[PDB]
């Protein structure tokens, strides 16, 4: 039997999540770093693994010490072998011990009192836009770099047509209301800061050649926290403490709340997202990976979607942890939370089957839809 916890992350200072461009890559303009609004779910996994061994006092401290053949299988039964290897995405199990299920990271507004937690979601890309697909008259099709697609018609659902000079659903975040959607702008939730950093270099003969960088730090608004759901077996009491969630020593306050064990976290997340469901859509709630987007395009009338980039730090149990980190062998392109897939008549079960075939990704908190 399994034990489920709600982990809430409160930022104690300005944080930063790295993207494809980091301050010390081999590319050209390696002095400006921009911060992604959310951490990767692999960062959440590494967070949980680090805190798990912190409670059990099993770390690497300084030289590249080796571990005796008891700490080895205690770390096996604690965290497993590897990090979030995207290579084993078609594996019907989490490749990690103790930890079984991790929900997609949630934006939670905690205002006052016990009250309730307002889960915030990105706006679906058709918020007040009514799409009117093929009036079947054999004419006026489209070629989406490929095969037939039946001419989407987007109207302001309130006539004129879709004017893209006044389209801003990708700058908005949404939450449950009293039968209407509450819309919050992205810039109100987050605050951006650009930092100038140098090396004073005083000494006598050092080459002043790389002593300048620009860092982007983001700050969540005061009544806003990050949260996610975890499932743990062979109960290790995940305690509240000070954590690291990646990026120039980012500090978060972990609060661990216990929930009823007779509850899977997936339909809890989907119950939170229920207020954004339409029969003709598939709202992408978490970044979604498909090995062949051509198949997905062939199974829908429209892909009102966006692209996001994924690159993971690959580290095993017997890893250096103190050297250059071997990042993921492949940058992977996932869809964006808020993307919508407009399927044809039927074929909804088929696209669901295509999306759900990646079980490692679904368990990690990826490829979640409503």
């Amino acid at each position: 039997m399994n034990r489920h916890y709600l982990i809430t992350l409160t930022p104690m200072d300005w944080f930063f999540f790295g993207g494809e461009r980091t301050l010390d890559d081999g590319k050209s303009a390696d002095y400006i770093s921009h911060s992604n609004k959310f951490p990767q779910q692999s960062a959440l996994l590494g967070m949980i693994r680090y805190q798990l061994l912190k409670q059990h006092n099993l770390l690497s401290q300084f030289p590249y010490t080796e571990n005796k053949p008891t700490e080895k299988e205690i770390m096996k039964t604690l965290i497993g072998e590897q990090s979030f290897r995207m290579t084993e995405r078609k594996a019907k199990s989490l490749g990690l011990g103790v930890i079984k299920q991790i929900s997609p990271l949630m934006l939670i507004e905690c205002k006052d009192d016990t009250s309730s937690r307002s889960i915030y979601f990105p706006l679906p890309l058709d918020d007040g836009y009514k799409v009117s697909f093929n009036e079947t008259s054999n004419e006026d099709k489209v070629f989406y770099n490929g095969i037939e697609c039946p001419i989407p018609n987007v109207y302001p659902a309130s006539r004129k047509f879709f004017d893209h000079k006044t389209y801003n659903n990708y700058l908005f975040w949404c939450t449950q209301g009293n039968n209407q959607i509450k819309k919050l702008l992205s810039d109100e939730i987050w605050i951006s800061k650009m930092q100038i950093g140098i090396t004073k270099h005083v000494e006598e003969g050092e080459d002043n050649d790389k002593s300048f960088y620009k860092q982007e730090f983001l700050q969540l608004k005061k009544s806003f926290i990050y949260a996610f759901y975890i499932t743990l077996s062979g109960e290790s009491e995940l305690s509240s403490d000070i954590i690291q969630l990646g990026g120039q020593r980012s500090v978060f306050r972990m609060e661990v709340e216990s929930i009823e064990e007779n509850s899977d976290i997936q339909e809890k997340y989907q119950t939170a997202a229920q207020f954004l469901t339409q029969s003709d859509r598939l709202l992408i709630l978490s970044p979604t990976y498909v090995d062949n987007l051509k198949e997905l395009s062939a199974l829908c009338n429209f892909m009102w979607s966006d692209s996001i980039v994924f690159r993971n730090i690959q580290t095993t149990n017997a890893s250096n942890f103190y050297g250059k980190p071997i990042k993921s062998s492949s940058k992977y392109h996932f869809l964006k939370p808020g993307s919508v897939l407009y399927f044809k008549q039927g074929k909804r079960k088929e696209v669901e089957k295509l999306l759900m075939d990646y079980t490692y990704l679904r368990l990690s908190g990826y490829n979640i839809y409503i």
Binding site: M12, D13, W14, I191, I196, V202, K210, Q219, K324
Partner: protein, 279 residues
């Protein structure tokens, strides 16, 4: 052992470069908090200054702050520095040379941050600070205020905003609060404190570059007035007891002076760091 509050207590005029684009007259401006627009020192600046002070202790620096730049070993630092916020600032007066200005909103933020970080020995401090703040709000009754705690200092004039400081004879100031917030302390509204610390009121200095009597360049610098008090929170991770003890004792020793700021050779930014005391 987890989170300790430290006070900076600058002995000279501080200039910490914001490095941002300038729209105005002062070519060099000091760092300010993005949300509150109050003067602040970045955690990177504090870490750099303290690391430079402890540079002669290779083991201490390696254990606390981590590996040096362009060193291949890639050692993270066991100590986390938090942004330094302005606690008290000197303010021109007429009865006395200056006054220690602490605004009610900075006191509220200090209480909130002490509760959030759960600072060492901060329970009594929070309780007494909250009693002080509640008594201040009771006396103020929603009006702008300027409260001093010495009967000699009653009727002091804050020159810049022209407000007279009254003495509330019903509110106590405990000795540890005098040690923390400063001597000759005045408590005023954040409305006045914002004016006292904006770009039009804090000192601006003209600086020159001369070449055989010819002025080659001209620019203006703004600085934070000396004797200003700033507080930052230090999160001592579970590190070596001996290096932590040595670092704390060296920092708290009255013989130590740390330079945080730009103009080192002309004596800008020299400070005396002190940790929170009991009570």
């Amino acid at each position: 052992m987890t989170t300790r509050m430290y006070v900076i207590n600058t002995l000279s005029n501080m200039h910490v470069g914001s490095g941002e684009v300038n729209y105005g007259v002062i070519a060099n401006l000091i760092q300010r908090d993005s949300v509150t627009n109050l003067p602040n020192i970045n955690s990177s600046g504090l870490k750099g200054a303290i690391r430079e002070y402890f540079k002669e202790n290779e083991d201490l620096v390696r254990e606390l702050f981590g590996s040096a730049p362009r060193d291949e070993k890639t050692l993270p630092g066991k100590v986390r520095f938090f942004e330094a916020n302005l606690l008290s600032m000197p303010v021109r007066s007429d009865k006395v040379p200056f006054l220690m200005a602490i605004s009610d909103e900075v006191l509220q933020e200090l209480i909130t941050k002490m509760k959030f970080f759960n600072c060492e020995e901060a329970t009594q401090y929070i309780s007494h600070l909250s009693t002080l703040l509640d008594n201040i709000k009771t006396q103020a009754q929603g009006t702008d205020f300027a409260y001093v705690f010495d009967p000699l200092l009653q009727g002091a004039i804050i020159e810049e905003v022209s407000i007279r400081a009254t003495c509330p004879s019903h509110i106590p100031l405990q000795p540890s609060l005098k040690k923390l917030l400063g001597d000759r302390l005045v408590i005023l509204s954040h409305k006045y404190f914002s004016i006292l610390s904006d770009d039009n009121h804090l000192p601006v200095l003209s600086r020159n570059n001369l070449e055989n009597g010819q002025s080659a360049n001209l620019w203006y610098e703004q600085v934070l007035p000396r004797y200003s008090r700033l507080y930052f929170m230090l999160m001592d991770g579970n590190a070596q007891s001996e290096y932590l003890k040595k670092f704390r004792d060296t920092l708290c020793t009255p013989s130590t002076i740390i330079q945080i700021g730009a103009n080192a050779s002309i004596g800008y930014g020299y400070c005396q760091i002190s940790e929170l005391s009991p009570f």
